[PDB]
Design a protein around this ligand. Structure first.
Ligand SMILES: [Cl-]
Ligand SMILES: [Cl-]
Ligand SMILES: [Cl-]
Ligand SMILES: [Cl-]
Ligand SMILES: [Cl-]
Ligand SMILES: [Cl-]
Ligand SMILES: [Cl-]
Ligand SMILES: [Cl-]
Ligand SMILES: [Cl-]
Ligand SMILES: [Cl-]
Ligand SMILES: [Mg+2]
Ligand SMILES: [Mg+2]
Ligand SMILES: [Mg+2]
Ligand SMILES: [Mg+2]
Ligand SMILES: [Mg+2]
Ligand SMILES: [Mg+2]
Ligand SMILES: [Mg+2]
Ligand SMILES: [Mg+2]
Ligand SMILES: [Mg+2]
Lengths: 123, 123, 123, 123
RNA sequence: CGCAUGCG
RNA sequence: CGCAUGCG
């Protein structure tokens, strides 16, 4: 009904700036939504939040807390060659990964280096 | 089960400085938590946020964002005689109140003078 | 072609938050535009900036610098009964009025008290 | 007419601290001003902004926003051997560069390592 | 308290 | 450097 690329681009078009943690969260939300076939509920929920006057950022946090697939979900791993591969406005939002990070607690993704070292992206 | 005073003391124990906007947030949190019997789940949430690398200040903010009693809650009105009754480190964080302030958006409390004039505390 | 009220409301609908210095600047821009019959050039210039991807705030500053009526213009006086009459997100942007304040240098308006004391709103 | 070195010294004389992002901005300003013969109008704009109550830091920002040579100007690339060659008080203000940085948007300079890796300075 | 964006 | 908004 909507593709993960169309949704991503729709959400990107509502976000201030570029390569922010919320941008990374768009990618995470759309990849988990595609793999669990929930892109349409994510889409509808997004556009309802906007219609009620929430910020797109609020709308994305609301998604992580309301849509079943993100509830209790662990952040997905993203492979990187170096910290230079991390989006350009996330660098100050990185921390060691805790034992049980959750998307509904602001853990967007786990960046993983070639040596297996990990960095948690945190909202 | 922890009492309101014990939770306040643990939280004050983690905070930097004296009479800050976050010391004021501790009192608001402990009072609402006591009235909804949420003191324990607030304590669990404080210590869970610290464990994943939140500052104490941020961890108090996480309480307002995740503990159900703080969802959409209006800040308490605190009656004062003069501006000097507000802790000095809170002064920089005062501003006129919005139409419908909410604790989970940063509005800690509303100071109110005898002639009904107000000063909002916003982190 | 467009009324000062319709334009104001259009510009207000693009501005983040409420009662900010840029909100006051909308009122100033639309009152000087009405009195000099330049509301339509102000309107067209505003919507061209947005179409090119400028922020509404950028668009308003661009207006003060490009539209003849604001060039070398002094801030208009606004009468107030007290500092409480100043929009609720301008309080930290007030200063003594200089001898020659200009709109194209970020002097939005001059607030004047009943005793004749003045406060400059500065961007 | 003031020389580049004299203008730098006047500006350093107004600034707090040592090796800050604003000391770096002074050097960029003085170098571009010297190359476009804008040193005098930069000096006039610095002293005009101070006179109307701008901090020295803000007054340097006003130069980039009002003096024509800084309009849409790209930050200079400064070649370095290591990160330690960047003044220590500038480190907090480093970030990855955007596609098309502009001085009048806050991009003071771009530090460049021997292998071509970059660090932007953003106030 | 901090990050992001916008603006000076 | 600061203000504004958003978010934690
Ligand atoms: Cl980009
Ligand atoms: Cl990957
Ligand atoms: Cl880090
Ligand atoms: Cl403080
Ligand atoms: Cl106190
Ligand atoms: Cl309002
Ligand atoms: Cl009036
Ligand atoms: Cl003041
Ligand atoms: Cl500094
Ligand atoms: Cl240095
Ligand atoms: Mg964007
Ligand atoms: Mg202490
Ligand atoms: Mg507000
Ligand atoms: Mg109200
Ligand atoms: Mg608004
Ligand atoms: Mg100094
Ligand atoms: Mg940028
Ligand atoms: Mg580039
Ligand atoms: Mg913003």
């Amino acid at each position: 009904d909507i593709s993960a690329k169309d949704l991503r681009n729709i959400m990107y078009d509502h976000l201030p700036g570029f390569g922010t943690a919320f941008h990374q969260l768009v990618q995470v939300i759309c990849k988990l939504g595609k793999d669990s076939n929930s892109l349409d509920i994510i889409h509808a929920e997004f556009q309802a939040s906007l219609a009620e006057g929430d910020s797109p950022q609020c709308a994305l946090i609301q998604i992580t807390k309301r849509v079943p697939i993100f509830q209790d979900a662990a952040p997905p791993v993203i492979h990187i060659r170096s910290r230079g591969d991390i989006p350009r406005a996330c660098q100050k939002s990185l921390r060691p990964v805790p034992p049980s990070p959750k998307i509904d607690r602001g853990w967007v993704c786990v960046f993983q280096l070639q040596d297996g070292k990990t960095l948690g992206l945190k909202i």
